[PDB]
Amino acid sequence: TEEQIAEFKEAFSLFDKDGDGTITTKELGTVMRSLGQNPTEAELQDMINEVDADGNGTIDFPEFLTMMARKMKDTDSEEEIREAFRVFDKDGNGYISAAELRHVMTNLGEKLTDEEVDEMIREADIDGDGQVNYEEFVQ
Amino acid sequence: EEQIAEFKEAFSLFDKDGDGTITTKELGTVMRSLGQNPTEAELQDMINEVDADGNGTIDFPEFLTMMARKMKDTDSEEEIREAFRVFDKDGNGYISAAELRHVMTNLGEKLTDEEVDEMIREADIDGDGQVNYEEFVQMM
Ligand SMILES: [Ca+2]
Ligand SMILES: [Ca+2]
Ligand SMILES: [Ca+2]
Ligand SMILES: [Ca+2]
Ligand SMILES: [Zn+2]
Ligand SMILES: [Zn+2]
Ligand SMILES: [Zn+2]
Ligand SMILES: [Zn+2]
Ligand SMILES: [Zn+2]
Ligand SMILES: [Zn+2]
């Protein structure tokens, strides 16, 4: 456990009174109340929306992690996209090359022709440089 | 950091014609330049241990495998595990449904609770409701 997952798993399961894997405004409100806080039904749905990546109005364990990390959903989202980008950028120079895309896609089970790889890099290459950078990846 | 600049320096030495790939011909020239007379078979062999895409020649990412001391199967397994780690947000060794949904969404694939639960279904071989590493390797 990191800056403790185990503790966050503890916390989450306190909040998630009914064990359904999500924390509602209802359940969130009960806990805040127990600590002598009086949030409104809007303050609560706001607390949830800060982290509600799948937009369902409720907090699942992953999104709960965002909360615990202090982050908003947009920031958490950007960390995850970067971890993805890093899987492809094997040499870590900030750009995915055609060879890297082909190499890693193949290693992840998706064998692509030199045709399909060159096309995928074409499409995403906005800077015009023959390589896919982080901002370019983000689409 | 310095490792990669020197690996990049090395690759360009080998890849005399700036191709972006290293052939048995080019590989053989450098070995010849130093101590050895490898056979065509020995060279094709050297390449085959890192040729992930099977095209018979060494590109730069495959060249990194060599320089990491690895074979292609080992390199491949590390890259899968890095992928698995993107999904396993809490790092306990299992991709939950909530995790798959959460990370797919954040990578620009919004899936229904329906499709996520199906995806975990199909890859979940031991029936525990979660996708472990070996199960992930199978799904890919
Ligand atoms: Ca609940
Ligand atoms: Ca570019
Ligand atoms: Ca190759
Ligand atoms: Ca997990
Ligand atoms: Zn949610
Ligand atoms: Zn997240
Ligand atoms: Zn790169
Ligand atoms: Zn060449
Ligand atoms: Zn590799
Ligand atoms: Zn399983």
Residue numbers in the entry:
A (entry chain A): 6 to 144
B (entry chain B): 7 to 146
Direct quotes from the study:
Calmodulin (CaM), a 16.7 kDa protein found in all eukaryotic cells, has been extensively studied as a primary calcium (Ca2+)-binding protein. CaM consists of two homologous (46% sequence identity) globular lobes; each has a pair of Ca2+ binding sites (EF-hand motifs), connected by a flexible linker. In apo CaM (Ca2+ free), the α-helices in the EF-hand motifs are positioned almost parallel to each other (closed conformation), whereas in the presence of Ca2+, the α-helices of the EF-hand motifs change their position relative to each other, forming an almost perpendicular conformation (open conformation). Ca2+ therefore induces a large conformational change, exposing the hydrophobic surface and facilitating binding between Ca2+/CaM and a number of basic amphiphilic helices on target proteins.
In the present study, the IQ peptides derived from Nm and Ng were present in the crystallization drops; however, no electron density was observed to confirm the existence of complex in the crystal. This crystal structure of CaM, in which no substrate peptide was bound (hereafter referred as ligand-free CaM), adopts a unique trans conformation that has so far not been observed. The crystal structure of ligand-free CaM was determined by Single-wavelength Anomalous Dispersion (SAD) method and refined to an R-factor of 0.20 (Rfree = 0.23) up to 2.02 Å resolution. There are two identical molecules (RMSD 0.7 Å) in the asymmetric unit. However, the PISA server analysis and gel filtration chromatography suggest that ligand-free CaM is a monomer. The Ca2+ ions were well-defined in the electron density map, located at each EF-hand motif. Besides a Zn2+ ion was observed near His108 for the first time in CaM. The ligand-free CaM molecule was in an open conformation, wherein helices of EF motifs were perpendicular to each other. The CaM molecule adopts an extended dumbbell-shaped conformation and the two domains are well separated. A close examination of the current ligand-free CaM structure with previously reported CaM complexes showed that residues Ala74-Asp79 of the central helix (aa 65–92) are unwound, and bent by ∼90° near Arg75; this reoriented the C-lobe in a perpendicular direction to the central helix. Thus, the present conformational change observed in the central helix of the CaM is independent of the bound metal ions.
